[PDB]
Design a protein around this ligand. Structure first.
Ligand SMILES: NC(=O)C1=CN([C@@H]2O[C@H](COP(=O)(O)OP(=O)(O)OC[C@H]3O[C@@H](n4cnc5c(N)ncnc54)[C@H](OP(=O)(O)O)[C@@H]3O)[C@@H](O)[C@H]2O)C=CC1
Ligand SMILES: O=C(O)CCC(=O)C(=O)O
Length: 416
């Protein structure tokens, strides 16, 4: 249907478990500032093409808005608004002095050359300059965007700003050569691993020697499996991608699987393991399920088939609202998406702090700070879900919306 309407409905459903005034809820149901701009670039053939750009600042009560820029051909203002709304709750649930933001360009970057991509990034910066800044709106990498594009955008912003303030802090997820931070590459997977370890501690389950299945095998999924094996001592019994999946009960080494996928396009037909389809992976008998591929993979039609005791929602919205009740009834502990994959935005916040302070941290300090942040956030959410006897997603919503509501009331934006 409409992604923004779905996000608003999910917030409205969560609002019944907390004391929030009608005026504040109506304020939260609509983004505070939406910017639509034309993004013109000169193509290689000499012609000029105009693209549609988006930048949505949902709420900046707790601080400057934070959110990545997507470059998908199916990008829609509704999707950007929904993702900015989710970004607000994400930054609020880990206690960040941030707001919720999101940006996007309706473009197919596959048919764009490197020069054209750089021109697109620079033109997007030249178009959205007046509503962004290190203390206003901090973008980041997202779908079909990378640190290279981030560096181009940072350079354009610095050129326009005339180096008056810290231009490194305008955008996060850039290369280490220019204001980048360590631990950014594995940030999401590291945060997910921290939350999984905390969930296992909460359920009284030892993670050593337990099977894990990961759906999707890219920046999130591959690193999630690798860190689960290396840090949590888990056995990786199955991975998957867009093509198919592979299942080996005795375990799989993530590095070999990644090399095979890079050399053959997909993890399919990996030797020593059986080829299985994506839907069969979610129904395995594993200790932890990590669907880090796409949204809405666990529906009402397959929720009863899940046998994992922990479902780590590394991807954005992998479980539908209907499947949430079925999963909870079976007694499965669910880690909500904007809490499970908050490590990426937490490390982006660390990068922004380093940029604005002009002082950069080591990998160990970043890892320890992220560990503490994710542990505190997860324990807050779990304690809220146990105290009020509500769903984990509902508890995360209560925790985030309470913070945003308190910020709004302290700013005097709402009275009630
Ligand atoms: N920094 C991050 O990585 C962040 C991660 N997330 C969430 O993590 C998810 C993935 O992020 P990232 O790893 O960067 O993305 P990538 O696109 O780099 O990797 C996603 C993986 O999912 C696979 N995949 C694609 N379509 C399907 C499908 N229909 N069914 C099963 N698997 C599929 C892809 O296979 P193939 O490569 O063959 O296409 C790929 O291996 C997203 O949903 C995102 O919202 C959240 C916040 C930020
Ligand atoms: O780092 C950020 O600001 C956002 C990362 C991201 O893409 C997400 O959390 O969805």
């Amino acid at each position: 249907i409409d992604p923004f309407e779905m996000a608003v409905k999910q917030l409205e459903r969560a609002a019944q478990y907390m004391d929030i005034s009608e005026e504040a809820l109506e304020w939260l149901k609509k983004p505070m500032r939406i910017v639509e701009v034309s993004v013109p670039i000169e193509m290689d053939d000499g012609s000029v093409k105009v693209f549609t750009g988006f930048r949505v600042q949902h709420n900046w009560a707790r601080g400057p808005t934070k959110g990545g820029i997507r470059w998908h051909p199916a990008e829609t203002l509704s999707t950007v608004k929904a993702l900015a709304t989710f970004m607000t709750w994400k930054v609020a649930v880990v206690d960040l002095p941030y707001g919720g933001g999101k940006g996007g360009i309706i473009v197919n970057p596959k048919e764009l050359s490197e020069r054209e991509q750089e021109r697109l990034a620079r033109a997007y910066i030249r178009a959205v300059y007046d509503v962004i800044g290190p203390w206003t709106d901090i973008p980041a990498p997202d779908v079909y965007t990378n640190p290279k594009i981030m560096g181009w955008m940072m350079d354009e912003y610095e050129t326009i700003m005339r180096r008056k303030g810290p231009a490194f802090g305008v955008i996060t997820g850039k290369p280490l050569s220019i204001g980048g931070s360590l631990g950014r590459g594995t940030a999401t997977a590291q945060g997910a691993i921290f939350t999984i370890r905390e969930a296992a501690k909460a359920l009284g389950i030892d993670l050593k020697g337990k099977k894990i299945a990961v759906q999707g095998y890219g920046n999130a999924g591959y690193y999630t499996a690798k860190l689960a094996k290396e840090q949590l001592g888990m056995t990786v019994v199955a991975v998957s991608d867009s093509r198919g999946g592979i299942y080996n009960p005795d375990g799989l080494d993530p590095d070999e699987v990644l090399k095979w996928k890079r050399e053959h396009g997909s993890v399919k037909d990996f030797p020593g393991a059986t080829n299985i389809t994506n839907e069969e992976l979610l129904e395995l008998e594993v200790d932890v399920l990590a669907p880090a591929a796409i949204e809405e993979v666990i529906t009402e039609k397959n929720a009863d088939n899940i046998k994992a005791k922990i479902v780590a929602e590394v991807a954005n919205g992998p479980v539908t609202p209907e499947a949430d009740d079925i999963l909870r009834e079976k007694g499965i502990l669910q880690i909500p998406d904007f809490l499970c994959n908050a490590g990426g935005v937490t490390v982006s916040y660390f990068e922004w702090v380093q940029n604005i302070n002009g002082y950069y941290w080591t990998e160990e300090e970043v890892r320890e700070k992220l560990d503490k942040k994710m542990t505190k956030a997860f324990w807050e959410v779990y304690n809220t879900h146990k105290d009020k006897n509500i769903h984990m997603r509902d508890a995360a919503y209560v925790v985030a919306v309470s913070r945003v509501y308190q910020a709004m009331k302290d700013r005097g934006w709402v009275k009630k």
